[PDB]
Write a protein that binds this ligand. Structure first.
Ligand code: GTP
Ligand code: ACP
Ligand code: GDP
Ligand code: WGY
Ligand code: CA
Ligand code: CA
Ligand code: CA
Ligand code: MG
Ligand code: MG
Ligand code: MG
Lengths: 348, 54, 425, 438
């Protein structure tokens, strides 16, 4: 009988995993403070990694990689890409970004203005986005003044002015990919992704109204008036999106987009593997990641950010959560297909 | 990757490699503490004997 | 040279105490005449803990036999190992106690207690470094219960910084001699709450059920019950009698088992308990599964009704100490709901190479469980069923006691129950 | 030449001390009778090994050591053991009854009545020293003597020997071999009262030594002898610079200068490699890069923790055997480009290296195999704070219910000393966090 604890009551994902584990009859849940556990579904912030792997006779496993925050933080990701030789500052799939600390607190203010003044002089598109509460503007004076009014670290990156627009609608969108990394640092990509689309026509002459520019599921469902028009919940899945790329663009999701996404996932996770791997550690880690991508009208994929505690599309909870139990939990704690994941081989 | 202060002798050598530059209670006070705890022990045993005498 | 002084009082106390010395004398190679005839140095390594060494290389137990009538001790003196006890250590009267706690504690017992303390003082003055005392007695009678607790009160006065340990037989209506046993047990329990550091609770009902259901003894006798007590007393004292480091000391045992001064009442357990299929080899998994099963427990309390504050396990014989740790960690990791989570690593395991007589290996269980409150609840209910009608009190008021003293003992034991209840949640 | 006095307190200290002096003797060619054929100066001399051994007219080399235990059974082994002839009776002190795993019993009740005797015996050793450096104190955290009496002895040493350095070798408690539930109490009580009196302390977590013995030495159920033979190899590596000719860590002061820039953070992590099974058919001898790289593996750290998620304040590499500086620097470069090594911004990113050409001495019949080269890395990492967190957590669990507190109050200790000691640890954990995390 395997034992586990639940220290994150808000995780819609592992709420289902906990439900599945108990459904097997071979997993028993303990109070969240019982140290005699095999598996920890740990909290988001300040997870006590230092107390894992010190229970005699218990192989302990946790659903978070210590140190993965370097990849799942706005400012952290920028610093990681610019400083890691594996990614280099010339990384071709990450928008030009800069770490900007508010003036009330290193900082890349002047470095940003240099690149900014260069674009302004060259007649090129000079629209940037600030985030950490987001502001889109073409004037550097507005972006910097917006961060100084706050009190947390922000990042300014180039705004993709030529995004791929779905038709009909002439609308923006992003792509969410779920990636599961097991204790052996195998990189599995869920075969099912979701396009979080904007139900509003993309308007390039007005960044004030951010309803057609931000594809967040909560924004379209709160400030958009065409929510759920073209697809239920502004969530087009790969089957539909693939058939679209064929009818309209005469290509496939695999060739035009999926190769770039698989390449980006590998590069990011392989980069930090020496820093977060639990191969020789007294405990074991695995984690689910939510990668967010952008597609421009040239069918080039850009990485937007990485989420360390992602949610899942309602339709895909059952399949994905079961996959988490098969490859991540039962792989270390077996029980008495056609895999739903795509293994991204690499050199450890 | 500099090597400084290399010292060598018959039974070994030692050196320093720099990769990157940077960016009580008195004797009296102890006796009091010890004698204070001894007094609290004596007091507790006196209450235990007082309890047994009753 | 950490000596322990043994005291056995009353009928039950002297009959169980006799069997105890019979068992461990064999385990240490001491024959009925006190001569050593063992074949292992481990037998003598810690022999001086329970035995004095006399001339001619004779080992004399450090035991004092006390009773208010001669009968039982005449049997011991004529028993198997009767000749091994120091003749001067027989302290007895002629009146008897008539199963009366007041007679043993206030009247008949008071007349004899000083002479018993003269022998105790004599044994202690010859100890290089006295650890403490261990008393065997029942709580349902008069001498072991009433005079036993009187002896403990007066020993704690003369040796206030030594450890007081007792094996206490709790009465049960299923194995009862008189109807006043709950009176005597309730009066003693209060004394034990105050003046002992460790008490092994032995319920005659559990001993009976084990003899009847598990051992398949049709008509159990006191002798059958005392066989279980012997084996248990040998198991819980192994840490003290042989080389080791886990426990191996009355005070160190107390520090690891008693998180609160009044909650020092232990449930002992033993394995195996086989009915005569007695030659079969017993594996480590089997030893562990049985040692934790309630049917192997001698307090007659269901552990699943409470929680273990601390646990001490002792495995005897040549076995895989690696395989012992695994099974132990398996029991804790398979029933962690029955262990308090505010005492980390509260389950300690000890190994001993010398197994009991006639067994390849065995396991003894010592638990400080909050379920023990069921035992005090039964006693309290039986006490109140009679005390509410003042039934049978004239036996006690005739010895100078007042009803108020009964009310106080009643409340004191109900407080003890309430104390266990708060730590169970 | 300046002398060093070793003090062994409690069972863990004494038994570990027995294994070290056994090793010291084999290393310096000293026999059980104290004779040393290679010492051509009979009855005296100021060689490096004289910092740990004095000499008599008859030519006996006597350790500068004191063994203290409140119970006589452990120290009786030393009196009749193989090296019974090394020590004279003045060096071995034993009481009649121990501290029962009770800090307050060792520090107050029993400590008060024996402290003056121990100091007198240490004073005798000091009077043979012409330039005493300080003391090396071996003890456990979890025992009542190792914890309680040690902190009392450290307080008095700071009084009787003000300007003398004091280093610790402390045994961190591990349940797989622990025999007491209250060891978290004792560990935290003894760290609080010793923190201001210890200039540098090397913590060894029994859990780590246990797992190394099972993993590398293939010992299914390690014993204290197995554990102590391995611990004395690490200890020997740390004290070798004081006993042999050299220029690094030549005196106890240099230990603080090189490993402890901040006073309270004086607990360097020890890492040792390689540990090869003697029963092995025959192992392939590892290179300088391979053993150096092993210093950054959690598997051979004296305390299991993740240095990848801390910041270094200092780093010493202590090599023994066939090693040349050219190979050390080459391996270090290779490790920098592969490992996550972050130094605090107010400290240089460097490595002090010491090399002793004599390879590790293995005890005949021991468990360790002879190797041609070995290394012990001493690094002051914030990552070792994981150990304080673990321990402070278990403390919080029991103290929230006052479980077992009556045993300490019963020995004259005030309950308020629990919270006072715990608050000090909370400030210690905060110090690490302020130095390591951004
Ligand atoms: N590595 C190692 N640890 C030991 C040894 N002896 C005891 N320990 C550890 O020390 C802790 C217990 O403290 P001890 O040193 O035995 O107790 P003590 O200092 O003698 O104090 P008291 O016996 O209570 O008077 C436990 O965590 C043991 O695992 C040893 O020889 N080697
Ligand atoms: N450089 C850029 N160019 C174009 N659009 C961008 C962009 N950066 C962000 N966006 C827009 O913002 C949205 C993503 O915002 P972001 O992910 O930074 O906020 P967030 O992290 O709170 C949402 P989540 O974490 O749930 O994916 C996308 O829908 C995208 O359209
Ligand atoms: N287990 C066991 N219990 C006994 C024995 N003799 C008496 N008892 C129990 O002890 C109680 C009677 O006390 P007893 O020892 O006979 O009275 P005392 O001589 O005045 O101390 C009753 O509960 C009996 O069941 C015995 O040999 N073994
Ligand atoms: C507590 C029980 C008790 O004292 N019983 C007892 C005592 C004396 C006598 S008599 N009548 O004097 O022989 C009869 C019974
Ligand atoms: Ca009379
Ligand atoms: Ca000399
Ligand atoms: Ca000082
Ligand atoms: Mg986000
Ligand atoms: Mg009777
Ligand atoms: Mg000891």
């Amino acid at each position: 009988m395997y034992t586990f604890v639940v220290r994150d009551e808000n995780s819609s994902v592992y709420a289902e995993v906990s439900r599945l584990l108990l459904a097997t009859g071979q997993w028993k849940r303990l109070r969240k403070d019982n140290p005699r556990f095999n598996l920890m579904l740990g909290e988001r912030n300040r997870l006590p990694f230092g107390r894992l792997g010190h229970e005699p006779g218990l192989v302990q496993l946790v659903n978070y990689y210590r140190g993965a925050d370097k990849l799942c933080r706005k400012a952290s990701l920028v610093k990681l890409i610019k400083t890691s030789p594996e990614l280099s500052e010339s990384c071709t799939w990450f928008p030009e970004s800069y770490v900007i600390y508010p003036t009330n607190l290193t900082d890349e203010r002047e470095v940003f203005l240099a690149a900014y003044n260069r674009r302004r002089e060259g007649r090129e598109g000079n629209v940037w986005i600030a985030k950490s509460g987001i502001l889109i503007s073409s004037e550097a004076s507005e972006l910097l003044d917006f961060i100084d009014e706050q009190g947390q670290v922000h990042v300014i990156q180039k705004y993709l002015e030529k995004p791929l627009l779905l038709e009909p609608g002439h609308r923006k969108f992003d792509i969410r990919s779920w990636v599961l990394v097991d204790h052996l640092y195998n990189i599995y990509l869920y075969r099912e992704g979701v396009l979080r689309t904007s139900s509003e026509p993309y308007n390039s002459a007005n960044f004030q109204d951010k309803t057609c520019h931000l594809t967040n599921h909560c924004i379209q469902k709160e400030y958009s008036k065409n929510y759920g028009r073209y697809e239920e919940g502004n969530e087009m899945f790969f089957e539909e999106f693939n058939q679209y790329l064929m009818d309209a663009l005469n290509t496939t999701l695999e060739n035009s987009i999926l190769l770039q996404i698989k390449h980006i996932i590998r590069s990011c996770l392989m980069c930090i593997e020496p820093a977060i791997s639990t191969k020789h550690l007294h405990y074991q880690s695995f984690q689910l990641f939510g990668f967010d991508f952008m597609v421009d009208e040239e069918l080039k994929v850009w990485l937007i950010e990485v989420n360390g505690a992602p949610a899942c599309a309602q339709k895909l909870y059952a399949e994905l959560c079961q996959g988490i139990v098969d490859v991540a939990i039962s792989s270390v704690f077996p029980l008495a297909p056609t895999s739903i994941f795509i293994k991204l081989h690499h050199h450890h | 990757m500099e090597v400084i202060e290399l010292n060598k002798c018959t039974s070994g050598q030692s050196f320093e490699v720099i990769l990157k530059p940077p960016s009580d209670p008195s004797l009296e006070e102890i006796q009091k503490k010890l004698e204070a705890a001894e007094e609290r022990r004596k007091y507790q045993e006196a209450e235990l004997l007082k309890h047994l005498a009753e | 040279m950490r000596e322990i002084v043994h005291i056995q009082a009353g009928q039950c106390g002297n009959q169980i105490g006799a069997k105890f010395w019979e068992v461990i004398s064999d385990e240490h190679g001491i024959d009925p005449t006190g001569s050593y005839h063992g074949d292992s140095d481990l037998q003598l390594e810690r022999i001086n803990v329970y035995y004095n060494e006399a001339t001619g290389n004779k080992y004399v137990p450090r035991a004092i036999l006390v009773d208010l009538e001669p009968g039982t001790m005449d049997s011991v003196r004529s028993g198997p190992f009767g000749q091994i006890f120091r003749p001067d250590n027989f302290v007895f009267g002629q009146s008897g106690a008539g199963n009366n706690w007041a007679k043993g504690h206030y009247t008949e017992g008071a007349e004899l207690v000083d002479s018993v303390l003269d022998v105790v003082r004599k044994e202690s003055e010859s100890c290089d470094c006295l650890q403490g005392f261990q008393l065997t007695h029942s709580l349902g009678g008069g001498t072991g219960s009433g005079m036993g607790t009187l002896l403990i009160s007066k020993i704690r006065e003369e040796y206030p910084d030594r450890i007081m340990n007792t094996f206490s037989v709790m009465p049960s209506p299923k194995v009862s001699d008189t109807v006043v046993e709950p009176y005597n047990a309730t009066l003693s329990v209060h004394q034990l709450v105050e003046n002992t550091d460790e008490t092994y609770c032995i319920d005659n009902e559990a001993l009976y059920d084990i003899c009847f259901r598990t051992l398949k003894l049709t008509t159990p006798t006191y002798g059958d019950l005392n066989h279980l007590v012997s084996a248990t007393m040998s198991g819980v004292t192994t840490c003290l009698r042989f080389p080791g480091q886990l426990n191996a000391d009355l005070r160190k045992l107390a520090v690891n088992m008693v998180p609160f001064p009044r909650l020092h009442f232990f449930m002992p357990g033993f394995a195996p308990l086989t009915s005569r299929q007695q030659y079969r080899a017993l594996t480590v998994p089997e030893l562990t599964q049985q040692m934790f099963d309630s049917k192997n427990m001698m307090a007659a309390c269901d552990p699943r009704h409470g929680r273990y504050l601390t646990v001490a396990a002792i495995f005897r014989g040549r076995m895989s100490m690696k395989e012992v740790d695994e099974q132990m960690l398996n029991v804790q990791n398979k029933n962690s709901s029955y262990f308090v989570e505010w005492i980390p690593n509260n389950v300690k395991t000890a190994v001993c190479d010398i197994p009991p007589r006639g067994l390849k290996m065995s396991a003894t269980f010592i638990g400080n469980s909050t379920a023990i409150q069921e035992l005090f609840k039964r006693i309290s209910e039986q006490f109140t069923a009679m005390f509410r009608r003042k039934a049978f009190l004239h036996w006690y008021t005739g010895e100078g006691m007042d009803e108020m003293e009964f009310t106080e003992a009643e409340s004191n034991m109900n407080d003890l129950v309430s104390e266990y209840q708060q730590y169970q949640d | 030449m300046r002398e060093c006095i070793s003090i062994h307190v409690g069972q863990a200290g004494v038994q570990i001390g027995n294994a070290c002096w056994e090793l010291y003797c084999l290393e310096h060619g000293i026999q059980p009778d104290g004779q040393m054929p290679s010492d051509k100066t009979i009855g005296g001399g100021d060689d490096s090994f004289n910092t740990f051994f004095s000499e008599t007219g008859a030519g006996k080399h006597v350790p500068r050591a004191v063994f203290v235990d409140l119970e006589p059974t452990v120290i009786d082994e030393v009196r009749t053991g193989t090296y019974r002839q090394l020590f004279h009776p003045e060096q071995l002190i034993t009481g009649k009854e121990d501290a029962a795993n009770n800090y307050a019993r060792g520090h107050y009740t029993i400590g008060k009545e024996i402290i003056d005797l121990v100091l007198d015996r240490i004073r005798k050793l000091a009077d043979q020293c012409t330039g005493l450096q300080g003391f090396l104190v071996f003890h456990s955290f979890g025992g009542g003597t190792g914890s309680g009496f040690t902190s009392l002895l450290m307080e008095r040493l700071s009084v009787d020997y003000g300007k003398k350095s004091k280093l610790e070798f402390s045994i961190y408690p591990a349940p797989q071999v622990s025999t007491a539930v209250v060891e978290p109490y004792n560990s935290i009580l003894t760290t609080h009262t010793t923190l201001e009196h210890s200039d540098c302390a090397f913590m060894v977590d029994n859990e780590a030594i246990y797992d190394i013995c099972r993993r590398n030495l293939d010992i299914e159920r390690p014993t204290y002898t197995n554990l102590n033979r391995l611990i004395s190899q690490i200890v020997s590596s740390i004290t070798a610079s004081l006993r042999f000719d050299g220029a690094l860590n030549v005196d106890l002061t240099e230990f603080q200068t090189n490993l402890v820039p901040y006073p309270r953070i004086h607990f360097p992590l020890a890492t040792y490699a390689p540990v090869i099974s003697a029963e092995k058919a025959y192992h392939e001898q590892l290179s300088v890069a391979e053993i150096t790289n092993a210093c950054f593996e959690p598997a051979n750290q004296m305390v299991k923790c993740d240095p990848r998620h801390g910041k270094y304040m200092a780093c010493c590499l202590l090599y023994r055997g066939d090693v040349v500086p050219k190979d050390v620097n080459a391996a270090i470069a290779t490790i920098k480009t592969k490992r996550s090594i972050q130094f605090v911004d107010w400290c240089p990113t460097g490595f002090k290296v010491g090399i002793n050409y004599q390879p590790p001495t293995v005890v005949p019949g021991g468990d360790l195999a002879k190797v041609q080269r070995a290394v012990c890395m001493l690094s002051n990492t914030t990552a070792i704070a994981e150990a304080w967190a673990r321990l402070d957590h278990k403390f919080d669990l029991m103290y929230a219910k006052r479980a077992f507190v009556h045993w300490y109050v019963g020995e004259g200790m005030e309950e308020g000393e629990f919270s006072e000691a715990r608050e000090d640890m909370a400030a210690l954990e905060k110090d690490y966090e302020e130095v390591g995390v951004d």
